[PDB]
Design a protein around this ligand. Structure first.
Ligand code: AMP
Ligand code: AMP
Ligand code: AMP
Ligand code: MN
Ligand code: MN
Ligand code: MN
Ligand code: MN
Lengths: 477, 477, 477, 238
């Protein structure tokens, strides 16, 4: 919204930049890259672009459209804090050679089109996303899948399951302070073993332009951690999420650790979710508040929430896209499984943080998502679910500030939950996607590609492989 | 149909029997037991019975019905070939103390009631079952489920995945002959490493009264094996299956091996199924044939087949009752996944073996079942599916002798398959069970108990635990 | 030619036979089996047969022909000397249920049809085959094929490559006598380490009806060995070869060894071949001799030889059917690579043993074949090559008693050799197979099946995998 | 530059505790390593490979050079893909340029004309089939001689395939020529297809005879006489 090309040249110029890392997002959600010498990075890359050698088989920009044009997004230019050779990282939008038309399967293009569509509805001219991604810090991870056996094991020298260890990771003595204490989850050192590592991560984020002003905290619980930062407009909020994951993973890596953002790495500990705060603004002021409406919610907010709860079953195909997502979205660890909004029920898919009569502070929060997917597609899908709700004025059900345990499990069973497996949401998406195709944001092809990838690469592979617990249950049958 | 109490006394008398093993079947399918001295086993046990100390919490004969009466089934009396102290094994029917009424949750009672109901329909007075259960012979099995990891591993010294082993199970040299050859699956020794063990198993079966007359073969393929034997009337065919599994497991056990009847112990090898042949007879002659009908099938047979294919989705809840069942009933190893009958398509749920114009040899075969459950409940459910088809004359679809690959996948997609997960069939049963409750064979309570047990003890436990392959797919997200 | 069903019953009756092993040959050449109780083996099996449960995917008796009928060959009935439970082994011919017509892809049926066709030509009424199969006796074998590496290793405690070993296979001292001596290859003990094992093998062969009358010897050289026995009519000579391999492999197995009949298990030692002697007889007297003809060869013999040399390039597809066959048929170890007949040149594909003026002793010898394939198909293909030569009177080239080294390599280059790779002979067969389809002995389908199997299961798999020597040659490129 | 590049890559890895390989197929189950070569002819200081009237903006100078490449490819590969390992890459998979057709599209085609539009200078052809297992001096020279035999004699190949060869009948897709399958094949194809090489005295018969001798005695025969590990998996039990 403020930075342009020439400024990127000054960042590169002032920093004695040796290399420029060309980044773009693949379908599932991992950033791809190739590097060019800094000397080859000038005005030509911006207006004219760079061709990316027609790669990949199972998807993306084929070969009868052979090459692609990579146009840089100057807002995403950041100095890499890990690479020895001074490098500038920049995200690009993918195009084709016939009419240089933006590739409809580039996740970054879907997010930008979603922002443009917001404008094409007249509702607002800005969608703000403030996602808080949790992660685990481990020391090791190993796994395999063979004909006669399979295993996995994540380990943390100071993990709570290691209280009985004779010696430590380096042969050093077991000094304790591993066991977690019932209930309260954020003890100070030495129970907190990752204080300095989390600080390096936060320092790296702050040096990479992350805004830490309002209620932005650095929190840790055992091996789990979260560093929330200020929101941004849709597309660039998704870019910030990718940058965040990159900084978290590599800070851990350079400090002898290994991080995972998977929804459920531990059976017996908190899952990792991506709690996303949303709101619509216009001309420079809020649109989510009204004291006459519950929790200080405007009629603009209630209907966006209506769309989220109505389309949730299919929305989850982009919001909780993995098989592992459903080990978190299962009975436990108050993971947003209930399809109701409220300032109270945090186990509710949507939570309106207590912000009173302040129109600007008023925001909704879809707590159900996780960080196992594509933030560009997830945020875009969330907007499309909400826009289908505001325009068509979709009315959901009453907010539940009254907790669902003290209540009859008849009216608590009538409280909808989301599907139980990835195969379910992929089916719910296969049938609930008109809101997605509106304004040409998501194409049928893109949705068909996502469904294909998930079934062939995730659902079926896990499904054909016997689970270790099946041996505990059935070897003796 | 021929043996009575006094004969059981002579078997025990002639064999210098020291102990009598009192056996009964639990809900999921494993035989339970307690032993009494042979001297305490007389006419009193038969007409009066034995009380079984009010046990078990999660099910069966509670405590305000406190005790049970165990009446012996003289047809099931067999000398145990494994127990050092000479023992006679006998199966019992479970009862209660108020009116000594047969407990409606005893699997053996469900099977006997099914035989009585066959008679109460007038259709026939005998249901013959000839099931062929496959199994794997291993050398070891280990597995666990922890907070930070999980694994399983089955091993066979001469398993095909061990071609590269430096030495063997006992430090002895790797002598080869492990690799399996593409296509053909029954090579002679030394590729066949279990010749003598299978012979001990067959010798033990023959000594335990198993009839090996017609096309009954002893076959082995790698570590997998099958020893089919002559059919029997429903209840006692289920008793024979339990006896068979007992003899197979313990012959392996006494010979330094470990057997498993689980549907899919190996990812990359044939699954283990329970191919069940069925037929209805009356007064002493067949009822399944007619040359005018396809494959020499009478109109009595076609409708039984109609019921099987119609009720299959729910029938599988008793026929393929485990989570592991669905690793076999998945795309591959021509496991009966297609809901059509035929003399040809073996990947079809039902196969009518080529028996020509012989009314007696004419029989249908439900190849979809596996040995992971309860044979009493599985056979009974199969009969009830077929009886709902004969009486109400349920017409299915045309037999497919023409293989489904060479054909358009439109008409091949219209070819129904069974549900994909255990949770699906449990849902299909929850709604498709009227045929089961007919004649009071299966009670709503029994069906409700089965559904509860499966959801709480199998479906949910596996579902909440991360699969090892999820780490391969998502640790790096 | 002499034994019938009733005699088989007496063999089984006199020997207290517990089991009967039903054997049949698969496409590539390995015997398959299933066992039935001896009590189920009576007159019914002979005239009526046994159905073999419609198995195998990649070939053989499909499923719209679902079942097969197994008719026993009483000439092949032998008592198994290895199986603990007294067993009778018998080979069967494969059939179908529509008109019980012999399956045209059963190797044993191809051999029997070849014998019948010999009669349908009027040329003779008997084809005699006397093949001598060599093999290696090892102590161990291990190998694998992975993404980043591959290996294989055969070992023999007393192998000539182990002269430097500090201790032996069992930790015992290295007692020497391993090194082979230049030239002469059959030293007495202790250089000969397998004297007693070879004797057990010969004793087992003799007890299994193998005729050891004429120049039948038991010979050993290092770990290699050969026990030649008396010839037999085509089909049953192929049955004897299967029995021989079975007895050799299992005698080794029960005595802590492992045998291989592969053409070239060792790089630096003699390959293993199957030198096959042939001849045509009629009414009870010979047809291969004439003093007027070279080496005492009749005009009947010269033309059979003409067919062998003419059709050799394609004949080798059944005669030397593996990729490993071509490590033997390469420059070295005088393996019959030259397409000329002679009493002299043993490196010639055909060798007429010195038998002088004796019409009966006169026989031709195709020394090129190995034991890596199917003897039924190999012998049949040899007959068809020879019959195409006798009938059409195919004239080859002059016999070479004069060795091909002392001679100009111009006239020695004009001396044809056989193709260099399996892919070559499979191509030569794809085009040179009319002699095979004559009289309906080999069907186009059978030949097409063989070509498919070889390309997909052998040629391509080996071809796509980098050879270890490529790393020695090219890692540094 | 190619020799210098390999030297710098290998030794940078070496001084940093690693070991590099340029062999065509070091891994069974991962991408092979190829040497995608872009070519073009220039005169006096300006391009000669472009023309909008011609397909992909190709001049008649370019089409015939491409004609020579596709015509002589079977023998050209003896210098362009000179090792036994070269044929583990040039096998069905990892879109290795196995098809003898040029195109801006089919990358599995031996020749690919990168999208460069109407810019005469940017117009270049790309022989993607080669690998780095041989001699770059001989490989580049052989490529030029294949192309020069095409421009002078005006050798016309076949139509460019921007339409991918999977969606199409495997009859017209089988008529689409591929290169030989083994090193022994290309060495034979060179033994007979080398006049373009001897033109102008660039490659001598002796040099070609030396190459053929070296390959047969030092590479083809040595690998051929040695049993492959997979043969034990397939045949130990025969
Ligand atoms: N319109 C908005 N106004 C203010 N904050 C927002 C808006 N849209 C999204 N947010 C994000 O709400 C997130 C934090 O939640 P919490 O765990 O309650 O501290 C932050 O990441 C915010 O910056
Ligand atoms: N009514 C019946 N008549 C004859 N055999 C039957 C009947 N009902 C069930 N069977 C069983 O069919 C089974 C065998 O199948 P297969 O794998 O084709 O040899 C055996 O276990 C038979 O004994
Ligand atoms: N017609 C025949 N007359 C005599 N021996 C034969 C005939 N056809 C094949 N043979 C076989 O020739 C083989 C032996 O060869 P050798 O290594 O020279 O001792 C033996 O296995 C013979 O029994
Ligand atoms: Mn939150
Ligand atoms: Mn069956
Ligand atoms: Mn010989
Ligand atoms: Mn390229």
């Amino acid at each position: 919204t403020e930075k342009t090309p020439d400024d990127v040249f000054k960042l590169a110029k002032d920093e004695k930049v040796e290399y420029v890392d060309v980044r773009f997002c693949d379908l599932p959600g991992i950033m791809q890259h190739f590097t060019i010498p800094a000397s080859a990075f000038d005005k030509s890359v911006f207006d004219d672009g760079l061709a990316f050698d027609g790669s990949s088989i199972r998807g993306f920009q084929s070969i009868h459209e052979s090459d692609m044009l990579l146009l840089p997004d100057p807002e995403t230019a950041r100095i890499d804090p890990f690479r020895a050779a001074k490098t500038l990282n920049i995200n690009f939008f993918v195009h084709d050679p016939f009419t240089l038309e933006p590739y409809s399967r580039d996740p970054r293009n879907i997010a930008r089109k979603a922002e443009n569509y917001l404008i094409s509805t007249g509702i607002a001219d800005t969608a703000y996303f403030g996602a808080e991604a949790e992660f685990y810090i481990f020391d090791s991870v190993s796994f395999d899948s063979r004909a006669n056996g399979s295993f996995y094991e994540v380990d943390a020298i100071s993990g709570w399951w290691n209280t009985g260890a004779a010696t430590e990771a380096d042969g050093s003595p077991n000094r304790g302070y591993k066991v977690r204490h019932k209930g309260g989850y954020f003890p100070v050192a030495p129970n907190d073993q990752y204080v300095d590592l989390r600080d390096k991560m936060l320092t790296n984020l702050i040096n990479s332009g992350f805004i830490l002003e309002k209620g932005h905290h650095e929190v840790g619980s055992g091996g789990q951690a979260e560093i929330n930062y200020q929101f941004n407009s849709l597309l660039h909020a998704a870019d910030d999420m990718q940058l965040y994951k990159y900084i978290i993973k590599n800070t851990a890596w350079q400090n002898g650790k290994t991080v995972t953002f998977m929804p459920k790495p531990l059976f017996g500990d908190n899952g990792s979710g991506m709690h996303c705060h949303q709101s619509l603004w216009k001309d420079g002021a809020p649109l989510m508040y009204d004291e006459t409406g519950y929790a200080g919610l405007s009629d603009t907010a209630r209907h966006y929430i209506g769309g989220l709860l109505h389309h949730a079953p299919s929305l989850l195909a982009f919001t909780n896209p993995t098989v592992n997502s459903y080990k978190r979205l299962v009975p436990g660890y108050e993971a947003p499984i209930n399809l109701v909004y409220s300032q109270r029920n945090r186990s509710a898919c949507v939570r309106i943080p207590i912000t009173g009569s302040n129109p600007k502070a008023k925001r909704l929060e879809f707590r159900s998502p996780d960080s196992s997917g594509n933030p560009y597609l997830a945020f875009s899908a969330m907007l499309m679910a909400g826009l289908d709700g505001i325009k068509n004025k979709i009315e959901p059900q009453a907010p539940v500030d009254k907790d669902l345990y003290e209540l009859p499990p008849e009216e608590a069973a009538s409280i909808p939950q989301t599907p139980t497996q990835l195969s379910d949401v992929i089916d719910r998406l296969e049938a609930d996607h008109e809101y997605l195709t509106e304004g040409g944001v998501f194409t049928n092809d893109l949705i068909e590609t996502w469904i294909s990838f998930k079934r062939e690469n995730e659902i079926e592979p896990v499904n054909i492989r016997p689970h270790p617990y099946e041996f505990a249950l059935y070897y003796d049958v």
